């Protein structure tokens, strides 16, 4: 009910994330999950990330990439969301210091990311419905990521 | 959000300061440019409030003390701004030191020698907010400017061909051989992908690290009444503050290491292929 | 060859055998003081403890 997915085929790759800073959210084949928090009581989205970092393919954007939560705030139902235009709001909620450091147990080749505690105060009153409430999970960067 | 683990989150704050990008936002106005105590500095969701040194809300309606909270982090403000500055535009490259230990021979096959202790045409500067200093080009030009025709290194500078071999391939940052006093804008490696610049205001060690973290003392005092040990631990903990931190010597380590290990072993770095 | 220091990453199940004398935040004390524990613990700290 409260957690579905976006469907393969669309591709919303380059989105500005910060002040003149860019991340490829890269929206296509099973992009994490779409957390459907459209008037789903009142909760605190306690995101507990550890293990998972999986460094960018082969980008020197290894530094500056964080485990984040982004809520999506649009009157355009997810299956309609094909270009940037659609989004209304992509709000990066859950990252804290949104750069990066190699918190991953990297010494031995491992890409184990240190245990993070993320919080998104899901209070439906904050929005009160209407631009129906979504959220995603991602290694979000300022430092621009190579979509190709 | 009342602040917790105060000295640490303070730590983090200041780390944002130290790497220029710190969200220093008082109510309506985006940067605490003038000394009007900020309200929202995003420390990974923790909205820091200069008003109280603490977070979200001010300590009182006593805009004098509240600004004083602000004033307390005069070190933080100044560092932040300053690092932004240096990593965008700063003390110009007035002449370059080692005469000329490099060459660009664009003559079908690109004969581009790098020898020992080169010199510095490169300025880089710009784009500290998560971009490649000179446009999107930093990346590519540094290829040439380390391995091929290294437009960085020199006298007390970059310990490449003894140690940190090829900065096309290897992580760290590249010092600017400049006659003009210490305008050392340390261009990141091509492999690092995102090529920022860090001007070493005092050139050998990490220097800022103590200096910056030390401003959490001022934090800790007017937030949590008095700064509990802090620096006693911070002094060792963080990379050494030596000298002023305005484009000056420091010498020392970069004087020994980088000066020789620029070349030292292999001494040489070359490119011959049409690219450069 | 094996440049990695080491990556032996699993579980570490502390068995606190000595039910004698419970620790207040690293401080091996004969004391349990609830009211002062208040606001001196992050989620991380609790979990870690």
The strand pair at A66-73 and A21-27 is best described as unpaired
CB B76 within 8 A of CB B12: no
Counting Cβ atoms within 10 Å, is residue B94 exposed (0-12), middle (13-18) or buried (19+)?
A: exposed
CB pairs under 8 A between A and B: 54
Residue B58: domain span: 3-88
- Give the distance from CA B244 to its chain's centroid: 15
User: Residue B69's closest CA among B16, B120, B26?
Assistant: B26
In 3-state terms chain A splits into helix, strand, coil percentages (rounded to 5) of: 10, 40, 55
Q: How far apart are CA B117 and CA B99, in angstroms?
A: 10
Taking the C-alpha atoms of residue B260 and residue B117, their distance in angstroms, rounded to an integer, is 8
Q: Which two tokens stand for residue A110?
A: 């491992």
Residue A72 tokens read as 């999506």
Note whether C5 contacts A108, CB cutoff 8 Å. Answer: yes
Structure-derived torsion over alpha carbons of residues B130, B136, B140, B144, reported in degrees to the nearest 10: -90
Strand-pairing partners, residue A16, are A22
User: Chain A residues with CB-CB distance to B under 8 A?
Assistant: 18-22, 59-64, 93-99, 119, 141-144
Length of chain A: 148
Q: Do residues B23 and B30 touch, judged by C-beta distance below 8 A? A: no
Burial C13-49 (b: 16+ CB within 10 A, else e): eeeeeeeeeeeeeeeeeeeeeeeeeeeeeeeeeeeee
> C42 in contact with B at a CB cutoff of 8 Å?
yes
Scan for tokens 């600004």, then name that residue: B67
> What is the distance between the alpha carbons of residues A30 and A51, in angstroms, rounded to a whole number?
20
Q: Chain C: nearest CA to B274, how far in angstroms?
A: 34
Nearest CA in chain C to A106: C4
Residue B254 region by backbone torsions, left for phi larger than 0, else alpha for psi between -120 and 50, else beta: alpha
Q: Which chain B residues touch C39 with a CB distance below 8 Å?
A: 4
Token code pair at residue C31: 């004391």
CB neighbourhood size of A48 (10 A): 10
Reading across the β-sheet that carries B109-115, which strands appear in turn?
B105-107, B109-115, B268-271
Spatial CB neighbours of B186, under 8 Å, sequence gap ≥ 6: B173, B174, B175, B176, B197, B198, B199, B200
Say which residues have a Cβ less than 8 Å from residue C17's Cβ, sequence separation at least 6. none
For helices B74-86 and B63-72, what crossing angle results, to 10°? 50
Distance of CA B90 to the CA centre of its chain: 12
**A143 close to A20: Cβ distance less than 8 angstroms:** no
Report residue B77: phi and psi, to 5°.
-55, -55
State the Cα torsion A133-B55-A143-B238 to the nearest 10°. -150
Question: From residue B189, how far is each of A126, B174, B205 by CA, in Å?
Answer: 44, 8, 18
For residue A48, the chain C residue with the least C-alpha distance is C44
DSSP class of A31:
-
Q: Are C44 and A110 inside 8 Å of each other by CB?
A: no
Tally of helices (H runs) and strands (E runs) in chain B: 9, 8
The one-character DSSP state at B113 is: E
Rounded to whole angstroms, the Cα distance separating B98 from B116 reads: 10
Q: What is the 3-state secondary structure (H, E, C) of B218-253?
A: HHHHHHCCCCCCCHHHHHHHCCCCCCCCCCECCCHH
Give the relative orientation of helices B74-86 and B6-18 as an angle to the nearest 10 degrees.
Answer: 30
A49 HSE (CA, 13 A, CB side): 24
Q: Which chains touch B (3 or more CB pairs under 8 A)?
A: A, C
φ, ψ for residue B220 (rounded to 5)? -50, -30
- What residues of chain B lie within 8 A of the CB of C38, using their CB? none
Inter-residue contact B16 to B2 (CB < 8 Å): no
Nearest to B130 among A21, A97, A119 (CB): A21
Residue A140: its H or E element: strand A133-140
Please tell me if residue C30 touches chain A, with a CB cutoff of 8 Å: no
- Which of C7, C11, C41 to mutate to test binding with chain A, by most A CBs within 10 Å of its CB? C7
Task: List the single residue in A20, A60, A97 with the smallest CB-CB distance to B193.
Answer: A60
């Amino acid at each position: 009910k409260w957690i579905a997915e976006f469907n393969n085929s669309s591709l919303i790759r380059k989105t500005l994330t910060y002040s003149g800073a860019t991340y490829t959210v890269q929206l296509g084949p099973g992009p994490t999950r779409v957390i459907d928090m459209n008037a789903m009581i009142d909760s605190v989205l306690t995101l507990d990330v550890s293990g998972t970092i999986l460094p960018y393919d082969t980008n020197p954007d290894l530094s500056t990439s964080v485990p984040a939560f982004v809520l999506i705030q649009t009157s355009v139902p997810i299956q309609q969301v094909t270009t940037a235009a659609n989004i209304t709001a992509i709000t990066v909620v859950s990252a804290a210091g949104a750069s990066a450091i190699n918190l991953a147990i990297n010494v031995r080749g491992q890409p184990r990311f240190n245990m993070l505690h993320l919080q998104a105060t899901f209070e439906r009153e904050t929005i009160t419905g209407i631009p129906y409430i979504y959220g995603l999970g991602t290694f979000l960067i300022p430092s621009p990521t190579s979509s190709s | 959000m009342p602040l917790h683990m105060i000295p640490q989150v303070a730590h983090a704050m200041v780390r944002a300061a130290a790497a220029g990008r710190l969200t220093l936002y008082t109510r309506t106005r985006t940067e605490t440019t003038n000394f009007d105590h900020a309200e929202y500095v995003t420390c990974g969701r923790y909205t820091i409030c200069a008003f109280c040194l603490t977070t979200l809300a001010p300590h009182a309606n006593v805009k004098t003390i509240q600004d004083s909270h602000a004033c307390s982090r005069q070190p933080n403000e100044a560092i932040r701004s300053l690092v932004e500055v240096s990593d965008k535009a700063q003390t110009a490259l007035v002449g370059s030191r080692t005469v000329d230990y490099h060459e660009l021979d664009v003559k079908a096959g690109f004969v581009a020698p790098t020898a020992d202790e080169t010199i510095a045409p490169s300025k880089d500067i710009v784009e500290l907010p998560f971009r490649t200093c000179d446009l999107d080009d930093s990346s590519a030009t540094a290829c040439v400017r380390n391995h091929c025709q290294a437009g960085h290194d020199g006298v007390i500078h970059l310990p490449i061909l003894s140690g940190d071999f090829k900065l096309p391939n290897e992580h760290p940052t590249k010092p600017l051989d400049d006659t003009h006093p210490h305008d050392k804008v340390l261009t990141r490696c091509p492999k690092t992908g995102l090529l920022l610049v860090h001007d070493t205001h005092a050139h050998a060690t990490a220097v800022v690290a103590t200096a910056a973290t030390r401003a959490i003392l001022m934090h800790d005092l007017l937030t949590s009444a008095n700064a509990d040990d802090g620096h006693q631990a911070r002094s060792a903990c963080y990379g050494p503050a030596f000298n002023n931190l305005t484009f000056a010597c420091h010498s020392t380590c970069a004087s020994d290491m980088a000066h020789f290990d620029c070349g030292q072993i292999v001494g040489l770095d070359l490119h011959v292929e049409p690219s450069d | 060859n094996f440049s990695n220091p080491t990556l032996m990453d699993g579980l570490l199940t502390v068995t606190p055998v000595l039910l004698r004398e419970t620790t207040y935040k690293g401080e091996v004390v004969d004391a349990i003081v609830p009211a002062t524990v208040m606001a001196n613990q992050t989620s991380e700290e609790v979990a870690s403890a």
